[PDB]
Nucleic acid binder design. Sequence first.
RNA 1: GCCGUCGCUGGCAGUCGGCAGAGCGAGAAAGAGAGUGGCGCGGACGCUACGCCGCGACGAGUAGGAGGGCCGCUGCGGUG
RNA 2: GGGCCCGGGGGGCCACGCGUCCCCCGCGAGCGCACGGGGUCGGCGGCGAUGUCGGCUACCCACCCGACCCGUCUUGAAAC
RNA 3: GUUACAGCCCCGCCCCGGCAGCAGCAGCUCGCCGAAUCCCGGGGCCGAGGGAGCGAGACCCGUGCGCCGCGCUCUCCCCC
Lengths: 109, 44, 53, 223, 4, 49, 49, 176
Amino acid sequence: SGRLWCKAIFAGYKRGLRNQREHTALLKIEGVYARDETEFYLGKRCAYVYKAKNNTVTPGGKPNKTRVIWGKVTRAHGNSGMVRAKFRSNLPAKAIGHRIRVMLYPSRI
Amino acid sequence: KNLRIMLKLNPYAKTMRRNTILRQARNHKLRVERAAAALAAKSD
Amino acid sequence: RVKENDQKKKEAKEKGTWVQLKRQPAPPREAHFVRTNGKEPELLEPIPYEFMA
Amino acid sequence: KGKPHCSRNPVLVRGIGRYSRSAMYSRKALYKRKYAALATVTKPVGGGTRVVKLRKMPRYYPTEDVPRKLLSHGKKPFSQHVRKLRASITPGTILIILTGRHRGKRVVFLKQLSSGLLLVTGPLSLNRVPLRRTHQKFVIATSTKIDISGVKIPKHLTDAYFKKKKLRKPEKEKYEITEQRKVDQKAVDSQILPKIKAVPQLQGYLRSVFALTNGVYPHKLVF
Amino acid sequence: RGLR
Amino acid sequence: EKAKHYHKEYRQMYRTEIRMARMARKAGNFYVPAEPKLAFVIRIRGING
Amino acid sequence: NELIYKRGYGKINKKRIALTDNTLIARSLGKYNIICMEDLIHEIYTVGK
Amino acid sequence: MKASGTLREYKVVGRCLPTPKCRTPPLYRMRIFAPNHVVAKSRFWYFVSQLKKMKKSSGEIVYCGQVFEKSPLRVKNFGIWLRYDSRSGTHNMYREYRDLTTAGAVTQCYRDMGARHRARAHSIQIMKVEEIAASKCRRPAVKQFHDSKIKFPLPHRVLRRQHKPRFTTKRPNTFF
RNA sequence: GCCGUCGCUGGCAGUCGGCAGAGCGAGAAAGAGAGUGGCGCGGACGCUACGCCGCGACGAGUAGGAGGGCCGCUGCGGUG
RNA sequence: GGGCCCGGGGGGCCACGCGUCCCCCGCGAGCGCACGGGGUCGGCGGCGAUGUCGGCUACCCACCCGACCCGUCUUGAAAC
RNA sequence: GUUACAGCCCCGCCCCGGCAGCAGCAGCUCGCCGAAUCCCGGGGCCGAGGGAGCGAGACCCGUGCGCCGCGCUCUCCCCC
Ligand SMILES: [Mg+2]
Ligand SMILES: [Mg+2]
Ligand SMILES: [Mg+2]
Ligand SMILES: [Mg+2]
Ligand SMILES: [Mg+2]
Ligand SMILES: [Mg+2]
Ligand SMILES: [Mg+2]
Ligand SMILES: [Mg+2]
């Protein structure tokens, strides 16, 4: 067993300077620091994974405190490897600067 | 972007495209044939 | 123009031809050839500044 | 009635034939191929007979009904969709599974089933993955291949063979490995396994598990 | 007519 | 058939201008093509002020 | 070509109608012998009568 | 004119429109360094207007075409005669450049005239461009490359890949 | 995509059914004309016409004007 | 180059009945696939009775971005 | 000082001296294009509408893949 996802940081939301578009998240991925290295990740699944107080069901498992908001990478962002991600619900602002998981599927290689 | 939509408007588009596909494939073959002849000539 | 129009309208009618009657704005000039007559075009250059004060 | 003949217009591209109308007309010889202009069942009864109505009118009508749909085209059922496959996934290719309990295990691709799902084997003796179906979008195809060109896979290994059989609970109900499945596992494994052992260290590779580690980034490394 |  | 004819017409117009210029150059002269008859205009400014 | 094909809308009965059928052109401009997209492209491109 | 990108040399031929008085007006030519041809024709009408009683309305462009460099693979010294307006006058200058294409030397001129004199390209009128032999050059910066046995190192080679890696264990080396 | 407004002073009385026969969107006026001589008993919804349906464009607003409120309050005649 | 790319002596054609006079020299049948008048599957998986599933808005709390107190006179009000 | 033990530039004749190649997979030495332009692939968002009829017909009461556009096959016979 071992890790099967790439380490990403929830950098912030899509924004100008004084307007915030919370439906899109800007993700920084480890080792991706050019716009041309982001092509592998486009369309990949993203998962903000966290813990809460009340137990919740787990697919293929028994209830625990883990929770996840799913999303996927939609496009690159800027010249330095950032990608825009969209989630089934807008990410909470408390998650900025914290881990976002980037999966290896849907695989295109 | 939609072939059958273009033909409902301009039926002659189908002839034009078929000729292009055939002409371009024919032209590609010659460039390959002309290349092989020169390469073999260089080998000589 | 009315008198000229009517005559052309009348005269052309008996000769079975269609002539233009309506004026038109000046069209873009049509393609043509410029003969050089074996003379190279004169080269022009900007002149130096001079304080002719 | 004549026998069907293969289309005389070879496909140049999708929707365009190789030959024009007049070219096809000559090819089909259309110059000489010219042409010119129950509901009731009667039965006996012990009246003598009755005219029986095959289908009877409804005995109940809902207060409201929905209208019909407008007709569309190109919306085929799943069974009629065309199946695609990545050029990198060729039979004998080693795939890394990304999901399920077997995630991270390197398996051997055998063939694509009629539903587009992939057939893979562990083989069971190397990583404990049996003859199993998997989805191509959820695997990573490596560049490591073995030649299973001479392997005969049973023809009864179809989508219907691998489809889950529903289990009813009123406590639980446990899946049981059928004896046919075990026999099939040895039939396929007994051929693929020797081919695995020809490649040095390959068997150890199939026992190991894939994982991402410090400084290893998927976009950088060849599989 | 000719077509027929 | 109208499209088939316009295709030939467009080709003749395109080839004709090239042929005209080639013969002017051959003779050492200049072929000045016809001033364009058609323009496509695009509005690039808003409606304020 | 690309302008009239991708973004060609007729002004028919003072409405904006996508030119998805040749009949749309023929009914309105047929009296001038413009009856298909190619005739419409030819009239515009060559600045016909 | 905006000296956008590398300029090109254009050969522009124009004349007065023929009239009953002069059925064949004389032809004039100009060397125009511009970004594209649409700009090239515009600047032609600006120069001939300054020299002749002519302008776009009462004249036509007989020929506009790009003049290609004749020896793009050979090093040359260029002399450029130009006049420009400063904040407080007009001046004539002679400058020299070393390049492979005459249009490259002119592009160097605009970037250089902007750098050393804050001269925007709308104030610069390039009068003349000539290829000059090494013996006839005047500028010491150009003459020092006229040395058959020229040699020199590359001291203190600055690190240009300063964010790959952004954080590193070893300090860079500037000596090579 | 959805809401409303404006426009087409747009379409629908044709639900013309076994006293039946299913159309009137179509580039280019005017008739799915009339005649005189040479087995089963069946066939959705609709239409408060102040109703229902379609298509296209559009939508800032103080002072001010107008419309619509199956918005709200109290009492009277009818009605439930 | 243009003349349905004039006339004479390997490759594509939205050529393909014929009686004729002669410039010139009004209905065939079927069947099938679809880049064809706006999406469907005639495709699947997991979990579920005492701790779990769904509940926009609403109650409390947190975070990110935004955010000056209304009415009024006024050219101008968050106005000291 | 003038090709020598390296080379550079210009001019005449050598078919513009001859050969590749040709806005070059020497994947960057310099352009503008596509009736002189086609093929394929990847990611993202979305699915509004809901009776379009077809053919048999007054010797028929069926069937809901129906318009327009583009194809295929059969009503001929051979060969691989
Ligand atoms: Mg402004
Ligand atoms: Mg308003
Ligand atoms: Mg703030
Ligand atoms: Mg504040
Ligand atoms: Mg006040
Ligand atoms: Mg005051
Ligand atoms: Mg106030
Ligand atoms: Mg104050």
